């Protein structure tokens, strides 16, 4: 009985592979061959924000391109003012194990999650001038890995129990549960239109979800190991993944297949974070080589290196207007580049 | 050309930095430990006189020194991703049950994996060998045989140089030293010397176990100071 089902599944998988390969006629390399390169660029750290006494795991730029929040192992979640390099808030955390944080697009809420299986939302703008816990969202059977605000009232989470969820804050209970993966889910990235997002798991596969229905639409399997971080192309029809094989890959939503892979022989270490530039021409990355790289998104040529951390780079983010780049590391200093 | 509000915001940031300095200064006084074991090892009952599904916490004091022992029981078998956090802890505590011989190889492989980790090249491990009483009863019964599992036990060198406990069975001493040497061989196979292992034998009912951890953490910190002072 089950043997017939397996045979049918294998036959359909072969059919899908053949159909996907039939649409590959010209590779992106031979199309983008006659393009003037970007040359060489150099970016120097413009500000270095001190105040953390421990490793920095995660960060998220604010929407106004000036404020950002960062989470550390010491148990403090503290918000910076980038231009003057002050501290706006310092939020003591109940659990010292914090692995993700996010800044709401409206700018008056901040989310936090880690090994305690609970996503905690903090209300920043309130009377009596103190940041109190708004809600403690619970219901995940594995450690929270990433969280991203959809709007003021909804937030999407990716947990360490092989599933993602979409919460409603006021009700305080899940309204959708994405359960298609087979391994641990490690990352997540919304889309500019805020109608469909993507996720990354330890089974070396990324899935393109939908927030209305809650059904996986497409799956991309081209990685030889777990993918650690994921972004979204600003056009909204492509994204970039990063695994511990020292290879970033560019996937397309409409073509349903990998387009380019960014690899080099001098690097054999893992990748922790990836992000895109304002025009998407530049694909940033963050490696375990105590430094970062800057990849040309159309030629896969290393067009820059940002070596300023004595420890590994954990988190990376590009400003909404594209004015600056901020990276956090385990040396308790996160520096802004431009 | 500075606004009063910017002056006040800078003063607020200075006060926040002062509070962070004070809190971080206070938080460093205590030492940190990571307790983990495969299964059926009684790792919970290591310390019992002195004493949120994802994380389990335990706080105990000995001679005015605070220890936070962190145990995680809400995770899967594969732990390679949440272990990167525990790289600045003082020492990892490993507990195994030598009573059960059927799953000794699993614990040995687990010790191999934790020893040869890439993020734990600077943490020393404190090894515990739990439930020695049951091992004593099993070996005195004469039912189970070690040659079936470990062919190297049949031909073993007498530990004449090693001093045994005063009054004990030679076969029991041979078996327990063989197990401990099997662990120590994997401990020293790397031969790096950056960090070492601290084996200990533990009874089912043992009143004192925090003193052992204290005397190993003191040795760990002393070795770190010796290394950092250019004396080694």
């Amino acid at each position: 009985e089950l043997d017939q089902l397996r045979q049918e599944a294998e036959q359909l998988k072969n059919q899908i592979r053949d159909a996907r390969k039939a649409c590959a006629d010209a590779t992106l390399s031979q199309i983008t061959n006659n393009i003037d390169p970007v040359g060489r660029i150099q970016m120097r750290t413009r500000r270095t924000l001190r105040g953390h006494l421990a490793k920095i795991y995660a960060m998220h730029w604010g929407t106004d391109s000036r404020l950002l929040v960062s989470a550390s192992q010491d148990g403090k979640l503290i918000i910076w003012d980038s231009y003057t390099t002050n501290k706006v808030h310092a939020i003591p955390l109940r659990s010292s194990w914090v692995m993700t944080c996010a800044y709401a697009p409206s700018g008056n809420y901040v989310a936090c999650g880690g090994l305690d299986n609970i996503c905690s939302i903090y209300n920043l703008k309130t009377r009596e001038g103190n940041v109190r816990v708004s809600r403690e969202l619970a219901g995940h059977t594995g450690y929270l890995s990433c969280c991203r605000f959809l709007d003021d009232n909804q937030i999407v989470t990716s947990s360490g129990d092989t599933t993602c969820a979409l919460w409603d804050i006021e009700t305080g209970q899940q309204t959708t549960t994405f359960t298609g993966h087979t391994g641990d889910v490690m990352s997540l990235s919304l889309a500019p239109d805020t109608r469909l997002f993507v996720s990354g798991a330890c089974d070396a596969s990324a899935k393109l979800w939908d927030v209305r229905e809650g059904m996986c639409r497409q799956t991309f399997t081209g990685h030889e190991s777990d993918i650690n971080a994921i972004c979204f192309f600003p056009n909204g029809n492509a994204f970039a993944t990063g695994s511990d094989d020292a290879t970033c890959r560019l996937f397309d939503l409409r073509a349903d297949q990998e387009l380019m892979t960014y690899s080099h022989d001098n690097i054999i270490c893992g990748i922790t974070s990836v992000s895109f530039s304002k025009s998407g021409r530049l694909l940033l990355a963050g490696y375990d080589d105590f430094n970062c790289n800057v990849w040309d998104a159309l030629k896969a040529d290393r067009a820059g290196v940002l070596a300023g951390h004595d420890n590994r780079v954990s988190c990376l983010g590009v400003t909404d207007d594209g004015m600056a780049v901020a990276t956090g590391s385990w040396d308790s200093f996160l520096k802004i580049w431009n | 050309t500075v606004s009063a509000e910017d002056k006040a915001a800078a003063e607020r940031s200075k006060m926040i930095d002062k509070n962070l300095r004070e809190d971080g200064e206070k938080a460093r006084r205590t030492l940190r430990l990571l307790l983990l074991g495969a299964d059926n090892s009684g790792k919970s009952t290591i310390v019992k006189q002195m004493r949120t599904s994802g994380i389990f916490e335990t706080k105990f004091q000995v001679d005015k020194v605070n220890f936070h022992m962190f145990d995680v029981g809400g995770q899967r078998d594969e732990r390679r991703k949440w272990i990167q956090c525990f790289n600045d802890v003082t020492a990892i505590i490993f507990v195994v049950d030598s009573s059960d011989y059927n799953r000794l190889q699993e614990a040995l492989n687990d010790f191999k994996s934790i020893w040869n980790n890439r993020w734990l090249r600077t943490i020393s491990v404190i090894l515990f060998l739990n439930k020695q009483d049951l091992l004593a009863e099993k070996v005195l019964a004469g039912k189970s045989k070690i040659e079936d599992y470990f062919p190297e036990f049949a031909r073993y060198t007498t530990p004449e140089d090693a001093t045994p406990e005063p009054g004990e069975d030679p076969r029991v001493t041979r078996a327990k030293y063989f197990i401990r040497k099997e662990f120590v061989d994997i401990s020293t196979a790397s031969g790096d010397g950056r960090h070492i292992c601290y084996p200990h034998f533990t009874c089912a009912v043992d009143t004192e176990n925090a003193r052992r951890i204290f005397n190993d953490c003191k040795d760990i910190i002393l070795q770190m100071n010796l290394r950092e002072y250019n004396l080694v």
Epitope: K125, G129, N130 | A4, A9, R12, K14
Partner: single-chain antibody, 228 residues
Framework: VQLVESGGGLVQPGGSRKLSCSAS????????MHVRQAPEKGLEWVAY????????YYADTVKGRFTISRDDPKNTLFLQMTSLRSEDTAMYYC??????????????WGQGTTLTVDIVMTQATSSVPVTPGESVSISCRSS???????????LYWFLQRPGQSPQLLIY???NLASGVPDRFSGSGSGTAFTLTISRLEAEDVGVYYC?????????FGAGTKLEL
Amino acid sequence: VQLVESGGGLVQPGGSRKLSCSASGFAFSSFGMHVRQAPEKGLEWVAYISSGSGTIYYADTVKGRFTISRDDPKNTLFLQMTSLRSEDTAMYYCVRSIYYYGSSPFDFWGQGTTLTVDIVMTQATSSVPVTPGESVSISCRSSKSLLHSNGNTYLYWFLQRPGQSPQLLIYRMSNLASGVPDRFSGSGSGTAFTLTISRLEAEDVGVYYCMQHLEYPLTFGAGTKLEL
């Protein structure tokens, strides 16, 4: 969130009196606290005590004889007065303020207790007759430019109903306070500031004060009364 005040009454000239403002309902240690009003004159700044008592400023009129301290555990701040003169009769307001990026200082004011014994800003309007349901505008001039290099214009709008303490309406010339209806709107350029009200209706008649926060001392406007 309340601020109650104690002290006042008849005082002979040259004496001493202590005003205590007790806060109950918010984190008192995180706020910088500040403002008096004569019987028939607009608000006049008096002094300022920072967060954690790390910085103190006074107006020149009250320098050397007014002292401020704050009992953070007691959740209260005081004002010690010595060598009172015949012209210090006023009503003293306990005012809170918190300063960080995106903050809204002067957002709450005390009840006020009667006691009886530099950037120059002018509001040309004194009394403007108005009809209900009619849009109005209130202008407040300045001596020097308030627009800073970073791009923030430090100007505030306060409203006092009859027999009530004033409250924040607009901070930094564009941003609205919390609980203020959207009809209020502030706009202008450097050295020219306007407050525009649309769909004006009842329970909006009072005295409108304009203040600067570019540098100390903080100078208010003369005020503009609205009448039917």
